A paper describes a structure:
Lasalocid A biosynthesis entails two stereospecific epoxidation of the precursor diene, catalyzed by the flavin-dependent enzyme [name]. We performed protein engineering on [name] to improve its thermostability and catalytic activity.
We found that the Tm values of [name]-[name], [name]-[name], and [name]-[name]-[name] were increased by 3.0 °C, 4.5 °C, and 4.8 °C, respectively. As expected, the FAD content in the mutants [name]-[name], [name]-[name], [name]-[name]-[name] increased by 29.3%, 46.7%, and 38.3%, respectively, compared to the wild-type [name]. The structural stability of the double-mutation system is lower than the [name] mutation system but higher than the [name] mutation system. In order to reveal the structural basis for the higher thermostability of the best two mutants, we solved the crystal structures of [name]-[name] and [name]-[name]-[name] at the resolution of 2.50 Å and 3.76 Å, respectively. Although the resolution of the second structure was not high, the secondary structure was clear enough for analysis. Comparing the structures of [name] WT, [name]-[name], and [name]-[name]-[name], it can be seen that the angle of the α helix between L408 and T419 shifts, which is in agreement with the MD study. Furthermore, the loop region R314-L316, E208-F210 and C398-Q401 in [name] WT change to a β sheet in the two mutants’ crystal structures, also indicating that this region is less flexible and more stable. After mutating to M189, the hydrogen bond with G192 was weakened, while there were hydrophobic interactions between M189 and L26 as well as P194. More importantly, M189 forms a hydrogen bond with the cofactor FAD that could stabilize the binding of this cofactor.
Author numbering: 20 to 487
Write the structure that this text describes.
Amino acid sequence: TRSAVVLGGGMAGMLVSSMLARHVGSVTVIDRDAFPAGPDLRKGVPQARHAHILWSGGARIVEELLPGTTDRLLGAGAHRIGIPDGQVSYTAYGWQHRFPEAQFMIACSRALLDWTVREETLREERIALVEKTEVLALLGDAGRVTGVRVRDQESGEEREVPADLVVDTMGRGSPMKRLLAELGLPAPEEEFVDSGMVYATRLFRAPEAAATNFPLVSVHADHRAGRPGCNAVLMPIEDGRWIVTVSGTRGGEPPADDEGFARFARDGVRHPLVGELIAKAQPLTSVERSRSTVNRRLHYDRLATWPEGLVVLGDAVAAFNPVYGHGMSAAAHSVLALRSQLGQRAFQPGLARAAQRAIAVAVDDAWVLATSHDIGYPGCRTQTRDPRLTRHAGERQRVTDLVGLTATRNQVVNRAAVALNTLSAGMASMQDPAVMAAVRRGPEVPAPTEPPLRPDEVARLVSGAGVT
Ligand SMILES: Cc1cc2nc3c(=O)[nH]c(=O)nc-3n(C[C@H](O)[C@H](O)[C@H](O)COP(=O)(O)OP(=O)(O)OC[C@H]3O[C@@H](n4cnc5c(N)ncnc54)[C@H](O)[C@@H]3O)c2cc1C
């Protein structure tokens, strides 16, 4: 028997549905949007206009739950950029020397990634996708949730969809607070770190030579400096295009005009690299800024009471800054925290209280890595009580500076760094006796004085057809 219901159809909803469908009978995915039968931009996912990094940890977790996604993505035009052999990033501590492949990423427009995860998840006959359907209230009481009360927007007919487990994958704009309040509970301990970052993405047609096999280029800010931090990223996607993304916090926001965007990429960031790489490229669209870039975590886990059958994961319990790129891996890791809680307790009481506390730990790494750098920015309003950001947050800032400073010129420290920053290990793995010893060993390669671009990569920026 057993029956689940997943609210939302995003990266979180599809993933958790592909894991639940192997643990229950029927999975009913509810959403209020129009899902397209073709990698097109959607209104429920407006982030799809800006590029989305899928780190290794989230990549091989999507692959585990959706076999055949990586190769299908890699066949539609997505690249498997290695790390740090396929990235030319100006870190806060210098240029990242391009060591051999330690971890990897998946670079593609979010519209494709959401599709390749959707059409692969919907291959199971038990998952029933229900589009254009608003959610009104949760069915049950304050001790057990039994389903949802939805209503179609095209017909207006109300109904009662019940299930043994209600999953909330309703993005950053999760009305969970409203749905829970009507159920009869208090408000969760809201915690947020608001740096005020302002995204600014604009597509770029890569040169004909650099359509395939081009490295993830980025110029990062110095979180130890007193200036408003501002980054700039140039990752390649499908169909031979380039996503150029600039960012900035409260005080150094990027402009809206197209003519000013090409300036911020080379006259606002700490190095004018990307601004030179976009002068080799054909602009397509305009600047489509997004301001919903504020780490916000709602600790449902520490509530005094929690109903049975209700689980919240994705961007509904913990959403983070997009300049670091952990949103998808935190959701993927959260799904595995529910799975690693469904095999122990089955469908017994305590599932919700144990799956929420497990989801709490799953995103804890994606919550420190995000906020630990944002707290040091100017005029950032933060409402947080965890001591790792208040007191003795200097030691947490004094060590991370050292690890990141050595990782630029030390393989062992780098291979252990991107195994954590790309959510592929734990924060305890950075206390390895062979990592603390490699930090004390010091740099092993000189700091590059120029962008560590390979000649066979820079030569891929011009067509060269105007010569005999
Ligand atoms: C600008 C930007 C850039 C980002 N960049 C990155 C990045 O580089 N790397 C990374 O890892 N993460 C990134 N993220 C985060 C990433 O988008 C999210 O972490 C991820 O989408 C989480 O999936 P989700 O299903 O929880 O939310 P979503 O993917 O947003 O899914 C929400 C779903 O719920 C539905 N829904 C919403 N409201 C309702 C409602 N009232 N009723 C019914 N259904 C509803 C929507 O239609 C949608 O299907 C970025 C986010 C933004 C905004």
